[PDB]
Design an enzyme around this catalytic site. Structure first.
Site, PDB file in Angstrom:
ATOM      1  N   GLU A 278      -5.454   4.652   9.838  1.00  0.00           N
ATOM      2  CA  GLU A 278      -6.058   3.650   8.960  1.00  0.00           C
ATOM      3  C   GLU A 278      -5.734   2.271   9.492  1.00  0.00           C
ATOM      4  OE1 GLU A 278      -6.378   1.314   6.163  1.00  0.00           O
ATOM      5  OE2 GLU A 278      -8.396   2.144   6.402  1.00  0.00           O
TER       6      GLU A 278
ATOM      7  N   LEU B 289       0.878  -1.220   0.000  1.00  0.00           N
ATOM      8  CA  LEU B 289       0.000   0.000   0.000  1.00  0.00           C
ATOM      9  C   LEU B 289       0.878   1.220   0.000  1.00  0.00           C
ATOM     10  CD1 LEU B 289      -2.724  -0.919   2.570  1.00  0.00           C
ATOM     11  CD2 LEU B 289      -2.578  -1.439   0.244  1.00  0.00           C
TER      12      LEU B 289
HETATM   13  N1  LIG Z   1      -5.865  -0.898  -0.677  1.00  0.00           N
HETATM   14  C1  LIG Z   1      -6.399  -2.032  -0.208  1.00  0.00           C
HETATM   15  O1  LIG Z   1      -7.414  -1.994   0.511  1.00  0.00           O
HETATM   16  C2  LIG Z   1      -5.737  -3.270  -0.433  1.00  0.00           C
HETATM   17  C3  LIG Z   1      -4.797  -3.310  -1.459  1.00  0.00           C
HETATM   18  N2  LIG Z   1      -4.114  -4.522  -1.775  1.00  0.00           N
HETATM   19  C4  LIG Z   1      -3.170  -4.464  -2.859  1.00  0.00           C
HETATM   20  O2  LIG Z   1      -3.616  -5.342  -3.882  1.00  0.00           O
HETATM   21  C5  LIG Z   1      -2.487  -5.813  -4.604  1.00  0.00           C
HETATM   22  C6  LIG Z   1      -2.601  -7.342  -4.795  1.00  0.00           C
HETATM   23  O3  LIG Z   1      -3.778  -7.545  -5.615  1.00  0.00           O
HETATM   24  P1  LIG Z   1      -3.907  -8.796  -6.523  1.00  0.00           P
HETATM   25  O4  LIG Z   1      -2.562  -9.040  -7.220  1.00  0.00           O
HETATM   26  O5  LIG Z   1      -5.158  -8.595  -7.269  1.00  0.00           O
HETATM   27  O6  LIG Z   1      -3.816  -9.936  -5.510  1.00  0.00           O
HETATM   28  P2  LIG Z   1      -4.848 -10.897  -4.568  1.00  0.00           P
HETATM   29  O7  LIG Z   1      -4.498 -10.613  -3.147  1.00  0.00           O
HETATM   30  O8  LIG Z   1      -6.197 -10.783  -5.030  1.00  0.00           O
HETATM   31  O9  LIG Z   1      -4.170 -12.281  -4.866  1.00  0.00           O
HETATM   32  C7  LIG Z   1      -4.368 -12.859  -6.173  1.00  0.00           C
HETATM   33  C8  LIG Z   1      -4.249 -14.365  -6.075  1.00  0.00           C
HETATM   34  O10 LIG Z   1      -5.307 -14.784  -5.180  1.00  0.00           O
HETATM   35  C9  LIG Z   1      -6.036 -15.830  -5.758  1.00  0.00           C
HETATM   36  N3  LIG Z   1      -7.341 -15.351  -6.141  1.00  0.00           N
HETATM   37  C10 LIG Z   1      -7.831 -14.083  -6.061  1.00  0.00           C
HETATM   38  N4  LIG Z   1      -9.102 -14.105  -6.413  1.00  0.00           N
HETATM   39  C11 LIG Z   1      -9.416 -15.410  -6.648  1.00  0.00           C
HETATM   40  C12 LIG Z   1     -10.605 -15.964  -7.016  1.00  0.00           C
HETATM   41  N5  LIG Z   1     -11.682 -15.173  -7.148  1.00  0.00           N
HETATM   42  N6  LIG Z   1     -10.737 -17.280  -7.185  1.00  0.00           N
HETATM   43  C13 LIG Z   1      -9.633 -18.061  -6.986  1.00  0.00           C
HETATM   44  N7  LIG Z   1      -8.371 -17.501  -6.640  1.00  0.00           N
HETATM   45  C14 LIG Z   1      -8.348 -16.151  -6.476  1.00  0.00           C
HETATM   46  C15 LIG Z   1      -5.145 -16.383  -6.905  1.00  0.00           C
HETATM   47  O11 LIG Z   1      -4.182 -17.128  -6.224  1.00  0.00           O
HETATM   48  P3  LIG Z   1      -3.242 -18.352  -6.888  1.00  0.00           P
HETATM   49  O12 LIG Z   1      -2.448 -17.601  -7.975  1.00  0.00           O
HETATM   50  O13 LIG Z   1      -2.386 -18.820  -5.772  1.00  0.00           O
HETATM   51  O14 LIG Z   1      -4.222 -19.279  -7.481  1.00  0.00           O
HETATM   52  C16 LIG Z   1      -4.623 -15.062  -7.399  1.00  0.00           C
HETATM   53  O15 LIG Z   1      -3.415 -15.200  -8.203  1.00  0.00           O
HETATM   54  C17 LIG Z   1      -1.285  -5.428  -3.782  1.00  0.00           C
HETATM   55  O16 LIG Z   1      -0.689  -4.160  -4.254  1.00  0.00           O
HETATM   56  C18 LIG Z   1      -1.876  -5.139  -2.443  1.00  0.00           C
HETATM   57  O17 LIG Z   1      -0.979  -4.303  -1.678  1.00  0.00           O
HETATM   58  C19 LIG Z   1      -4.359  -5.681  -1.007  1.00  0.00           C
HETATM   59  C20 LIG Z   1      -5.294  -5.629   0.040  1.00  0.00           C
HETATM   60  C21 LIG Z   1      -5.992  -4.421   0.400  1.00  0.00           C
HETATM   61  C1  LIG Z   2      -3.602  -6.160   3.449  1.00  0.00           C
HETATM   62  N1  LIG Z   2      -3.593  -5.229   4.594  1.00  0.00           N
HETATM   63  C2  LIG Z   2      -2.708  -5.502   5.603  1.00  0.00           C
HETATM   64  C3  LIG Z   2      -1.368  -5.809   5.260  1.00  0.00           C
HETATM   65  C4  LIG Z   2      -0.587  -6.098   6.383  1.00  0.00           C
HETATM   66  F1  LIG Z   2       0.843  -6.444   6.246  1.00  0.00           F
HETATM   67  C5  LIG Z   2      -1.077  -6.114   7.703  1.00  0.00           C
HETATM   68  F2  LIG Z   2      -0.223  -6.472   8.865  1.00  0.00           F
HETATM   69  C6  LIG Z   2      -2.344  -5.808   8.000  1.00  0.00           C
HETATM   70  F3  LIG Z   2      -2.820  -5.803   9.329  1.00  0.00           F
HETATM   71  C7  LIG Z   2      -3.170  -5.545   6.922  1.00  0.00           C
HETATM   72  C8  LIG Z   2      -4.506  -4.215   4.666  1.00  0.00           C
HETATM   73  C9  LIG Z   2      -4.184  -3.062   5.344  1.00  0.00           C
HETATM   74  N2  LIG Z   2      -5.035  -2.013   5.513  1.00  0.00           N
HETATM   75  C10 LIG Z   2      -6.267  -2.101   4.945  1.00  0.00           C
HETATM   76  N3  LIG Z   2      -7.163  -1.067   5.159  1.00  0.00           N
HETATM   77  C11 LIG Z   2      -8.411  -1.094   4.612  1.00  0.00           C
HETATM   78  N4  LIG Z   2      -9.202  -0.036   4.820  1.00  0.00           N
HETATM   79  N5  LIG Z   2      -8.834  -2.174   3.912  1.00  0.00           N
HETATM   80  C12 LIG Z   2      -8.045  -3.227   3.714  1.00  0.00           C
HETATM   81  N6  LIG Z   2      -8.578  -4.267   3.068  1.00  0.00           N
HETATM   82  C13 LIG Z   2      -6.684  -3.262   4.217  1.00  0.00           C
HETATM   83  C14 LIG Z   2      -5.814  -4.350   4.091  1.00  0.00           C
END
Ligand SMILES: NC(=O)C1=CN([C@@H]2O[C@H](COP(=O)(O)OP(=O)(O)OC[C@H]3O[C@@H](n4cnc5c(N)ncnc54)[C@H](OP(=O)(O)O)[C@@H]3O)[C@@H](O)[C@H]2O)C=CC1
Ligand SMILES: CN(c1cc(F)c(F)c(F)c1)c1cnc2nc(N)nc(N)c2c1
Length: 206
Positions: A32, A25
């Site tokens: 947050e 992120l």
């Molecule tokens: N701002 C936010 O709130 C958040 C942002 N992020 C950001 O998102 C990015 C990662 O996103 P992304 O690459 O899309 O990764 P995901 O975390 O969605 O992981 C993708 C992997 O998860 C599995 N997967 C996801 N959806 C499915 C599905 N519907 N059915 C089966 N398997 C599934 C597959 O695993 P496999 O390949 O092992 O089959 C796929 O390759 C990062 O930059 C992260 O920091 C992450 C969380 C929160």
């Molecule tokens: C993926 N993630 C995250 C990653 C880490 F390494 C952590 F230790 C953790 F607690 C959350 C994270 C963090 N903040 C978030 N905030 C919001 N609002 N929504 C999310 N889904 C989120 C995920």
């Protein structure tokens, strides 16, 4: 025996729907952090004694969590992956889709169990959010909106805050966010890391 529960999505995103950069992120927001932990962990006291919330996450998101913070404490963790062989450790659940995770959860945390499912949160990343936004039980988005077009390489899949979706998704009053989260939440713009952000709750009818 599978869809008697709503899904909630929690996400932090920019005004251009950016959610991530380089598997992390691209912001450092103290509130947050506090807020994500509270919302995903909070169980209302009228819910059963055994109740614990679930966090569902994609495999890349799981791999992005430092080992020292895994699993996310005080919540039932499930990783969605199509890799049957992948070892998560600690009894963390693995499922091959959102609905396979829901079926696994109901099978594992059943009538008898000392732990019972409470709220179910989808916590990212982009690919899992796409499946959740398509799921017929998703009715609530806890959005942290970030007021800066911070450069991202991953984006949220549906523009739920925009005019085109405004007959389906509606932003609730802050006091209804606080009622649902069970605790006072900062209201309005928070400024850390050089820009403003704020907490919002959006809902839709199933
Ligand atoms: N701002 C936010 O709130 C958040 C942002 N992020 C950001 O998102 C990015 C990662 O996103 P992304 O690459 O899309 O990764 P995901 O975390 O969605 O992981 C993708 C992997 O998860 C599995 N997967 C996801 N959806 C499915 C599905 N519907 N059915 C089966 N398997 C599934 C597959 O695993 P496999 O390949 O092992 O089959 C796929 O390759 C990062 O930059 C992260 O920091 C992450 C969380 C929160
Ligand atoms: C993926 N993630 C995250 C990653 C880490 F390494 C952590 F230790 C953790 F607690 C959350 C994270 C963090 N903040 C978030 N905030 C919001 N609002 N929504 C999310 N889904 C989120 C995920």
């Amino acid at each position: 025996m599978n869809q008697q529960k709503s899904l909630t999505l929690i996400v932090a995103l920019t005004t251009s729907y950016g959610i991530g950069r380089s598997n992390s992120l691209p912001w450092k927001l103290k509130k947050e952090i506090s807020y994500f932990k509270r919302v995903t962990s909070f169980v209302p006291t009228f819910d059963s004694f055994e109740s614990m919330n679930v966090v569902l996450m994609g495999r890349k998101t799981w791999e992005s969590i430092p080992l020292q913070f895994r699993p996310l404490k005080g919540r039932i963790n499930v990783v969605i992956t199509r890799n049957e062989s992948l070892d998560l450790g600690n009894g963390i659940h693995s499922a091959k889709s959102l609905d396979h995770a829901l079926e696994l959860l109901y099978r594992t945390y059943g009538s008898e169990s000392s732990v019972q499912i409470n709220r179910i949160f989808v916590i990212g990343g982009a690919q899992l959010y796409k499946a959740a936004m398509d799921h017929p039980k998703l009715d609530r988005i806890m959005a942290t909106i970030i007021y800066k077009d911070i450069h991202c390489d991953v984006f949220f899949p549906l523009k739920f805050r925009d005019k085109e979706w405004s007959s389906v998704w509606k932003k609730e009053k802050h006091s209804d966010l606080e009622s649902w989260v069970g605790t006072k939440v900062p209201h309005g713009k928070i400024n850390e890391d050089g820009f403003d952000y704020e907490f919002e709750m959006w809902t839709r009818d199933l």
